């Protein structure tokens, strides 16, 4: 009980697929000392055509040029600090390398958990019933079909799922009929191929989970919102008010919930025609950004991500079949208050990621440690006369959401 | 105005009085570049000359 | 109407406008060699000179 | 405190990608017969015979 | 063990000290100078004004 060995017993560790897939090239060394705390990109232009015999354009309005923005901002600090009496800590921790191994992993895990939370908070598209898990081949291919149906081509598509879900797909693959290599691989290693249904499938064990939040009542919209392109050309966010809710409930709508508009359908963005899902049209959906309570009378004000643009003076920017007006019917996907682990699918150009270098703190010992492309600044100081040595590790990330209509959540359907 | 490089190397146990020194550095690079060689092949007084 | 104010940016140049100034007269005129290297705080806070 | 006037708000000269479409019907319908048959002399419409 | 340098301005030497507080994560700097005045003989100076 006194003699100890030197090899630390192995610990647990998550996996990294989210950081490697997001776009980390456009936003790289862009928030420097000159730009400030935020930078903004540009947006593509859309035009509309006039069909008149004789080609007389007089009187009729020519296309108006409106430019948008996509602003990225800086996040909070990822700080982990350790303090100790050097007398006891130097007893059996020489050169203090024991600290280094499990702290960078903590920093990276926290960063990727926050990244996943941001991705599922800002994503717009939704698929399937949240309760039902992923079991068959169609549950994965539907995401690729939807993404191709919208019209996104330039980039690369990805779908991320739980380890248990991968077994249910590998087990299904073991029942194939003609491919010796596929059957053999699934039987032996239980590894699904890279391209599953036309999209790049990935496995991740560390994945964020969310709570639905209690709700009740046949909700409907009370006041007609303003979804003109001039209002939402900088954020693709809009605020709506709901009526017919429960009398007084706190946490009526949590962050990440999906609200569906039944009578307003998606549009193929280029051809501006409705989207049809083989048997039924596809309705519009949006994501809650911040938690909302309910007051007396059941009036709930919520801010959503993803906007149903139906500008009537600039029709070229439409992204929904009809304008949402008063009395429309809405519903919230999922059950009352269950908690699930959502599954993510997105395009390459959905969200960005970057890190801000940190300068050396004056008159304090410092060093830089690198871990899969992330720079960590470590410092040591001896404040306090109680023989207490102190260290700290710092990291400063940056987030940006380009287009909410190129990502979201997806589940299985019965 | 003059902006000088910072190293925080010296002044380690030394008294400093002259703030009239500016630190400038020379920077060297080695690159691999594409160059076109012209072969003047005049036969008189040797032919092969690149 | 064209609303294209998001196609440009607000720019602050890296140039400093000139400021104000004073002049050095009194310091250059008085004598400094007598007191140079004659007082140190640790030793004390006063030094004495002998009158003729 | 109040270092706002030092920095500037910039907009990068990069355009984000958009949504595209595909064209399959225009390359399958007949185009050889109705190639220049409608001229200045012919008028707005031209006719073909039936078997 | 504090990062420092030396600066000059018309024959005057100034010390700069750079130090930082870790928990506050703040970088601060300071400049210092210590003068010393003497008066040899009061009967060798004064103020002159234009007499009427």
TrEMBL record, chain B:
The name this protein goes by in its record: Gene 3 protein
Q: Which residues of the full protein are shown?
A: 204 to 253 of 708
Q: Which domain of life is it from?
A: Viruses
UniProtKB/TrEMBL annotation, chain E:
Which gene is the coding source of this polypeptide chain? 5
Species annotation: Shigella phage Sf6 (Shigella flexneri bacteriophage VI)
The protein's name in its UniProt record: Gene 5 protein
**Region of the whole protein represented:** 372 to 423 of 423
């Amino acid at each position: 009980s006194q003699i100890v060995l030197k090899k630390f017993l192995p610990g647990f560790m998550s996996d990294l697929v989210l950081a490697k897939t997001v776009d980390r090239q456009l936003l790289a060394g862009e928030i420097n000392s000159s730009t400030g705390d935020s930078v903004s990109f540009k947006r593509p232009h859309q035009f509309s055509s006039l069909r008149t015999p004789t080609g007389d354009i007089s009187g009729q309005n020519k296309n108006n040029l409106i430019s948008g923005k996509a602003t990225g901002r800086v996040g909070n600090y990822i700080t982990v600090a350790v303090e100790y009496q050097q007398l006891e800590e130097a007893i059996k921790l020489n050169q203090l390398e024991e600290i280094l191994a499990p702290v960078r992993q903590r920093i990276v895990t926290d960063l990727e958990t926050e990244l996943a939370h941001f991705m599922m908070n800002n994503g717009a598209l939704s698929l399937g019933s949240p309760n039902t898990p992923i079991t068959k081949w169609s549950d994965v291919a539907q995401t690729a079909s939807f993404l191709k149906d919208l019209g996104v081509n330039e980039g690369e598509n990805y779908a991320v799922m739980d380890p248990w879900s991968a077994q249910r797909l590998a087990d299904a693959q073991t029942g194939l009929h003609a491919s010796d290599q596929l059957v053999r691989t699934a039987w032996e290693n239980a590894q699904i191929p890279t391209n599953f249904g036309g999209i790049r499938a990935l496995m991740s064990n560390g994945l964020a989970s969310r709570t639905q939040g209690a709700f009740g009542g046949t909700l409907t919209v009370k006041t007609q919102p303003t979804v003109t392109y001039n209002a939402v050309k900088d954020s693709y966010q809009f605020t709506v008010t709901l009526t017919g809710a429960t009398a007084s409930v706190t946490g009526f709508l949590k962050a990440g919930d999906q609200v569906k508009f039944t009578n307003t359908y998606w549009l193929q963005q280029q051809t501006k025609q409705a989207l049809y899902n083989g048997a039924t049209p596809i309705s519009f959906t949006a994501t809650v950004t911040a938690d909302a309570n309910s007051d007396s009378g059941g009036d709930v004000t919520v801010t959503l991500s993803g906007v149903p643009i139906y500008d009537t003076t600039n029709p070229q920017y439409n992204s929904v079949s009809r304008q949402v007006e008063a009395g429309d019917a809405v519903s919230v996907v999922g059950t009352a208050s269950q908690t699930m682990k959502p599954n993510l699918f997105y395009n390459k150009f959905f969200c960005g990621l970057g890190s801000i270098p940190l300068p050396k703190l004056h008159s304090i010992d410092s060093a830089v440690a690198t871990y899969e492309g992330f720079s960590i600044r470590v410092h040591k100081y001896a404040d306090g006369d109680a023989n207490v040595q102190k260290m700290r590790f710092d990291l400063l990330p940056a987030y940006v959401c380009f287009n909410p209509h190129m990502g979201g959540q997806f589940f299985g359907n019965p | 105005p003059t902006s000088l490089d910072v190293t925080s190397m010296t002044s380690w146990e030394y008294n400093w009085f002259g703030a009239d020194v500016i630190y400038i550095a020379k920077y060297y690079e080695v690159r691999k570049e594409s160059v076109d060689v012209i072969s003047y092949r005049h036969p008189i007084t040797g032919e092969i000359a690149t | 109407p064209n609303n294209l104010d998001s196609n440009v940016s607000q720019i602050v140049l890296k140039k400093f406008l000139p400021g104000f100034m004073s002049d050095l007269v009194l310091a250059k005129t008085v004598d400094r060699q007598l007191l140079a290297g004659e007082i140190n705080s640790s030793t004390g806070d006063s030094v004495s000179f002998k009158r003729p």
